[PDB]
Amino acid sequence: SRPIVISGPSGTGKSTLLKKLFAEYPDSFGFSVSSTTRTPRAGEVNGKDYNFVSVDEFKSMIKNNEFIEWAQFSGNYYGSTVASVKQVSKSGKTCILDIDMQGVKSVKAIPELNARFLFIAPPSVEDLKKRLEGRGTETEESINKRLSAAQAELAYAETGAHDKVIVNDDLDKAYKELKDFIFAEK
Ligand SMILES: Nc1nc2c(ncn2[C@@H]2O[C@H](COP(=O)(O)O)[C@@H](O)[C@H]2O)c(=O)[nH]1
């Protein structure tokens, strides 16, 4: 069917929502596997979480027009390829794209994808901050940066860019809303 673009700040539980969806409907949805130049992280699997590629290969991909969209984040490259999206869609599954607000804006200007847009918001920026500080892995400076980005995305969502906004203040309720949205059909 029409692909679904899901976006939202990291720390909102969005990865969990997708995990539940792929378990319950593994034959209905396919995940767009992004290409990235960043270093893999524990548990990540090449070809599943991401297509981890070199900088040379990423530059090559750009030059050969292999992307639907691409961006940099923290000095590394990320992008959605034409290939991954067609192998899934071709496959007969509904393609889900997990990309940031730059990606959303890019796909919006591709009328032919006819994508649907869903944004997963945090219950508040103050709660997002707590979660981020609660993990112990980032600096003061990186959290300020992520909070500014989250604020930007919340502001963009108020222009009505997304088909639906879901506030994830409970995993199972957001999961509900997610299903109601997706299976609305179009
Ligand atoms: N535009 C774009 N953003 C992406 C893509 N893949 C991942 N991102 C994003 O880049 C950020 C960093 O992802 P991480 O490195 O944490 O996996 C997140 O905002 C995430 O949504 C993609 O293919 N395109």
PDB file of N, CA and C and ligand atoms in Angstrom, residues 6-10 14 31-36 38-39 41 44 49-50 52 58 67 69-74 76-81 97-107 146 153, ligand 1:
ATOM      1  N   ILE A   6       7.349   7.416   9.477  1.00  0.00           N
ATOM      2  CA  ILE A   6       7.191   7.701  10.888  1.00  0.00           C
ATOM      3  C   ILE A   6       8.403   8.525  11.335  1.00  0.00           C
ATOM      4  N   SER A   7       8.124   9.614  12.051  1.00  0.00           N
ATOM      5  CA  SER A   7       9.219  10.395  12.602  1.00  0.00           C
ATOM      6  C   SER A   7       8.931  10.725  14.057  1.00  0.00           C
ATOM      7  N   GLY A   8       9.926  11.270  14.759  1.00  0.00           N
ATOM      8  CA  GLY A   8       9.688  11.750  16.124  1.00  0.00           C
ATOM      9  C   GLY A   8      11.040  11.734  16.856  1.00  0.00           C
ATOM     10  N   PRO A   9      11.215  12.471  17.907  1.00  0.00           N
ATOM     11  CA  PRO A   9      12.521  12.462  18.614  1.00  0.00           C
ATOM     12  C   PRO A   9      12.844  11.131  19.250  1.00  0.00           C
ATOM     13  N   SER A  10      14.133  10.778  19.270  1.00  0.00           N
ATOM     14  CA  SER A  10      14.607   9.593  19.981  1.00  0.00           C
ATOM     15  C   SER A  10      14.329   9.786  21.473  1.00  0.00           C
ATOM     16  N   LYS A  14       9.503   5.118  20.446  1.00  0.00           N
ATOM     17  CA  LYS A  14       9.138   4.855  19.070  1.00  0.00           C
ATOM     18  C   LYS A  14       9.693   3.526  18.544  1.00  0.00           C
ATOM     19  N   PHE A  31      10.317  -2.960   6.581  1.00  0.00           N
ATOM     20  CA  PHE A  31      11.086  -1.827   7.105  1.00  0.00           C
ATOM     21  C   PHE A  31      12.053  -1.307   6.043  1.00  0.00           C
ATOM     22  N   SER A  32      12.045  -0.018   5.761  1.00  0.00           N
ATOM     23  CA  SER A  32      13.043   0.598   4.882  1.00  0.00           C
ATOM     24  C   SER A  32      14.331   0.618   5.667  1.00  0.00           C
ATOM     25  N   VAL A  33      15.324  -0.048   5.056  1.00  0.00           N
ATOM     26  CA  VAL A  33      16.629  -0.207   5.674  1.00  0.00           C
ATOM     27  C   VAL A  33      17.526   0.930   5.180  1.00  0.00           C
ATOM     28  N   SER A  34      17.810   1.909   6.057  1.00  0.00           N
ATOM     29  CA  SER A  34      18.610   3.056   5.647  1.00  0.00           C
ATOM     30  C   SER A  34      20.079   2.684   5.498  1.00  0.00           C
ATOM     31  N   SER A  35      20.770   3.380   4.602  1.00  0.00           N
ATOM     32  CA  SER A  35      22.197   3.332   4.502  1.00  0.00           C
ATOM     33  C   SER A  35      22.788   4.341   5.469  1.00  0.00           C
ATOM     34  N   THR A  36      23.846   3.979   6.191  1.00  0.00           N
ATOM     35  CA  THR A  36      24.469   4.982   7.030  1.00  0.00           C
ATOM     36  C   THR A  36      25.974   4.765   7.093  1.00  0.00           C
ATOM     37  N   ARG A  38      27.575   5.735   9.883  1.00  0.00           N
ATOM     38  CA  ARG A  38      28.014   5.627  11.290  1.00  0.00           C
ATOM     39  C   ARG A  38      28.407   4.204  11.630  1.00  0.00           C
ATOM     40  N   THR A  39      29.231   4.110  12.664  1.00  0.00           N
ATOM     41  CA  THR A  39      29.661   2.879  13.314  1.00  0.00           C
ATOM     42  C   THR A  39      28.541   2.090  13.950  1.00  0.00           C
ATOM     43  N   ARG A  41      26.216  -0.176  16.418  1.00  0.00           N
ATOM     44  CA  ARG A  41      26.022  -0.199  17.853  1.00  0.00           C
ATOM     45  C   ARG A  41      25.633  -1.604  18.292  1.00  0.00           C
ATOM     46  N   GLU A  44      23.080  -4.061  16.792  1.00  0.00           N
ATOM     47  CA  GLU A  44      22.602  -3.677  15.453  1.00  0.00           C
ATOM     48  C   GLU A  44      22.993  -4.752  14.459  1.00  0.00           C
ATOM     49  N   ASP A  49      19.095  -3.405  10.757  1.00  0.00           N
ATOM     50  CA  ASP A  49      18.902  -2.121  11.423  1.00  0.00           C
ATOM     51  C   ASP A  49      19.173  -0.947  10.489  1.00  0.00           C
ATOM     52  N   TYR A  50      20.259  -1.148   9.761  1.00  0.00           N
ATOM     53  CA  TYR A  50      20.909  -0.313   8.808  1.00  0.00           C
ATOM     54  C   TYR A  50      21.786  -1.110   7.849  1.00  0.00           C
ATOM     55  N   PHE A  52      25.168  -0.610   6.790  1.00  0.00           N
ATOM     56  CA  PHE A  52      26.359   0.116   7.161  1.00  0.00           C
ATOM     57  C   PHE A  52      27.295   0.088   5.948  1.00  0.00           C
ATOM     58  N   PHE A  58      28.939   5.690   0.270  1.00  0.00           N
ATOM     59  CA  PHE A  58      27.829   6.664   0.430  1.00  0.00           C
ATOM     60  C   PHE A  58      27.957   7.786  -0.602  1.00  0.00           C
ATOM     61  N   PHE A  67      19.431   7.507  -3.884  1.00  0.00           N
ATOM     62  CA  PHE A  67      18.593   7.817  -2.708  1.00  0.00           C
ATOM     63  C   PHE A  67      17.265   8.464  -3.024  1.00  0.00           C
ATOM     64  N   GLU A  69      16.089  10.120  -0.399  1.00  0.00           N
ATOM     65  CA  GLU A  69      16.463  11.317   0.345  1.00  0.00           C
ATOM     66  C   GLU A  69      17.759  10.970   1.077  1.00  0.00           C
ATOM     67  N   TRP A  70      18.577  11.915   1.469  1.00  0.00           N
ATOM     68  CA  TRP A  70      19.746  11.641   2.334  1.00  0.00           C
ATOM     69  C   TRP A  70      20.111  12.881   3.137  1.00  0.00           C
ATOM     70  N   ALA A  71      20.806  12.727   4.259  1.00  0.00           N
ATOM     71  CA  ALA A  71      21.079  13.852   5.128  1.00  0.00           C
ATOM     72  C   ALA A  71      22.363  13.537   5.868  1.00  0.00           C
ATOM     73  N   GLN A  72      22.913  14.451   6.629  1.00  0.00           N
ATOM     74  CA  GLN A  72      23.980  14.163   7.573  1.00  0.00           C
ATOM     75  C   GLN A  72      23.432  14.461   8.970  1.00  0.00           C
ATOM     76  N   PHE A  73      23.931  13.733   9.939  1.00  0.00           N
ATOM     77  CA  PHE A  73      23.572  13.953  11.353  1.00  0.00           C
ATOM     78  C   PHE A  73      24.852  13.714  12.142  1.00  0.00           C
ATOM     79  N   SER A  74      25.352  14.657  12.928  1.00  0.00           N
ATOM     80  CA  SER A  74      26.602  14.484  13.666  1.00  0.00           C
ATOM     81  C   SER A  74      27.789  14.058  12.818  1.00  0.00           C
ATOM     82  N   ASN A  76      27.850  12.190  10.215  1.00  0.00           N
ATOM     83  CA  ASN A  76      27.728  10.934   9.466  1.00  0.00           C
ATOM     84  C   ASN A  76      26.558  11.007   8.491  1.00  0.00           C
ATOM     85  N   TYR A  77      26.559  10.162   7.478  1.00  0.00           N
ATOM     86  CA  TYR A  77      25.493  10.236   6.480  1.00  0.00           C
ATOM     87  C   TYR A  77      24.444   9.169   6.730  1.00  0.00           C
ATOM     88  N   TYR A  78      23.223   9.498   6.404  1.00  0.00           N
ATOM     89  CA  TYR A  78      22.101   8.616   6.451  1.00  0.00           C
ATOM     90  C   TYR A  78      21.195   8.809   5.245  1.00  0.00           C
ATOM     91  N   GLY A  79      20.587   7.745   4.733  1.00  0.00           N
ATOM     92  CA  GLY A  79      19.657   7.967   3.614  1.00  0.00           C
ATOM     93  C   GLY A  79      18.762   6.792   3.289  1.00  0.00           C
ATOM     94  N   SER A  80      17.619   7.101   2.690  1.00  0.00           N
ATOM     95  CA  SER A  80      16.616   6.159   2.250  1.00  0.00           C
ATOM     96  C   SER A  80      16.850   5.859   0.778  1.00  0.00           C
ATOM     97  N   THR A  81      17.064   4.582   0.467  1.00  0.00           N
ATOM     98  CA  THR A  81      17.299   4.237  -0.917  1.00  0.00           C
ATOM     99  C   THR A  81      16.037   3.814  -1.656  1.00  0.00           C
ATOM    100  N   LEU A  97       9.064   3.815   6.867  1.00  0.00           N
ATOM    101  CA  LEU A  97      10.289   4.607   6.828  1.00  0.00           C
ATOM    102  C   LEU A  97      10.465   5.293   8.186  1.00  0.00           C
ATOM    103  N   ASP A  98      11.594   5.085   8.839  1.00  0.00           N
ATOM    104  CA  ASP A  98      11.888   5.724  10.123  1.00  0.00           C
ATOM    105  C   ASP A  98      12.990   6.735   9.872  1.00  0.00           C
ATOM    106  N   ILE A  99      12.589   8.014   9.698  1.00  0.00           N
ATOM    107  CA  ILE A  99      13.550   9.046   9.308  1.00  0.00           C
ATOM    108  C   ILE A  99      13.295  10.330  10.054  1.00  0.00           C
ATOM    109  N   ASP A 100      14.195  11.307   9.942  1.00  0.00           N
ATOM    110  CA  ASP A 100      13.990  12.481  10.817  1.00  0.00           C
ATOM    111  C   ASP A 100      13.184  13.547  10.127  1.00  0.00           C
ATOM    112  N   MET A 101      13.075  14.731  10.749  1.00  0.00           N
ATOM    113  CA  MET A 101      12.256  15.783  10.102  1.00  0.00           C
ATOM    114  C   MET A 101      12.863  16.247   8.798  1.00  0.00           C
ATOM    115  N   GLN A 102      14.193  16.280   8.627  1.00  0.00           N
ATOM    116  CA  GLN A 102      14.740  16.584   7.308  1.00  0.00           C
ATOM    117  C   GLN A 102      14.192  15.618   6.248  1.00  0.00           C
ATOM    118  N   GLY A 103      14.186  14.325   6.585  1.00  0.00           N
ATOM    119  CA  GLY A 103      13.713  13.292   5.670  1.00  0.00           C
ATOM    120  C   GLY A 103      12.239  13.495   5.378  1.00  0.00           C
ATOM    121  N   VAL A 104      11.468  13.828   6.427  1.00  0.00           N
ATOM    122  CA  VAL A 104      10.056  14.039   6.193  1.00  0.00           C
ATOM    123  C   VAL A 104       9.863  15.145   5.160  1.00  0.00           C
ATOM    124  N   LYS A 105      10.547  16.258   5.351  1.00  0.00           N
ATOM    125  CA  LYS A 105      10.400  17.381   4.415  1.00  0.00           C
ATOM    126  C   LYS A 105      10.797  17.022   2.978  1.00  0.00           C
ATOM    127  N   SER A 106      11.824  16.165   2.861  1.00  0.00           N
ATOM    128  CA  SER A 106      12.290  15.686   1.557  1.00  0.00           C
ATOM    129  C   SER A 106      11.220  14.810   0.910  1.00  0.00           C
ATOM    130  N   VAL A 107      10.685  13.854   1.631  1.00  0.00           N
ATOM    131  CA  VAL A 107       9.697  12.932   1.045  1.00  0.00           C
ATOM    132  C   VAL A 107       8.414  13.663   0.713  1.00  0.00           C
ATOM    133  N   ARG A 146      19.564  18.098  21.480  1.00  0.00           N
ATOM    134  CA  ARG A 146      18.448  17.242  21.105  1.00  0.00           C
ATOM    135  C   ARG A 146      17.121  17.872  21.505  1.00  0.00           C
ATOM    136  N   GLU A 153      10.688  20.070  15.823  1.00  0.00           N
ATOM    137  CA  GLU A 153       9.764  19.112  15.247  1.00  0.00           C
ATOM    138  C   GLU A 153       8.342  19.298  15.751  1.00  0.00           C
TER     139      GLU A 153
HETATM  140  N1  LIG B   1      16.687  11.695   6.811  1.00  0.00           N
HETATM  141  C1  LIG B   1      17.068  10.499   7.332  1.00  0.00           C
HETATM  142  N2  LIG B   1      17.133  10.406   8.669  1.00  0.00           N
HETATM  143  C2  LIG B   1      17.454   9.161   9.111  1.00  0.00           C
HETATM  144  C3  LIG B   1      17.599   8.035   8.272  1.00  0.00           C
HETATM  145  N3  LIG B   1      17.986   6.937   9.059  1.00  0.00           N
HETATM  146  C4  LIG B   1      18.025   7.363  10.299  1.00  0.00           C
HETATM  147  N4  LIG B   1      17.775   8.708  10.402  1.00  0.00           N
HETATM  148  C5  LIG B   1      17.809   9.426  11.656  1.00  0.00           C
HETATM  149  O1  LIG B   1      19.111   9.951  12.010  1.00  0.00           O
HETATM  150  C6  LIG B   1      19.063  10.074  13.490  1.00  0.00           C
HETATM  151  C7  LIG B   1      20.194   9.242  14.165  1.00  0.00           C
HETATM  152  O2  LIG B   1      19.896   7.757  14.117  1.00  0.00           O
HETATM  153  P1  LIG B   1      20.780   6.897  14.969  1.00  0.00           P
HETATM  154  O3  LIG B   1      22.128   7.201  14.599  1.00  0.00           O
HETATM  155  O4  LIG B   1      20.411   7.190  16.296  1.00  0.00           O
HETATM  156  O5  LIG B   1      20.271   5.537  14.481  1.00  0.00           O
HETATM  157  C8  LIG B   1      17.593   9.860  13.983  1.00  0.00           C
HETATM  158  O6  LIG B   1      16.960  11.153  13.972  1.00  0.00           O
HETATM  159  C9  LIG B   1      17.024   8.997  12.884  1.00  0.00           C
HETATM  160  O7  LIG B   1      15.610   9.126  12.592  1.00  0.00           O
HETATM  161  C10 LIG B   1      17.365   8.132   6.874  1.00  0.00           C
HETATM  162  O8  LIG B   1      17.481   7.207   6.077  1.00  0.00           O
HETATM  163  N5  LIG B   1      17.129   9.423   6.509  1.00  0.00           N
END
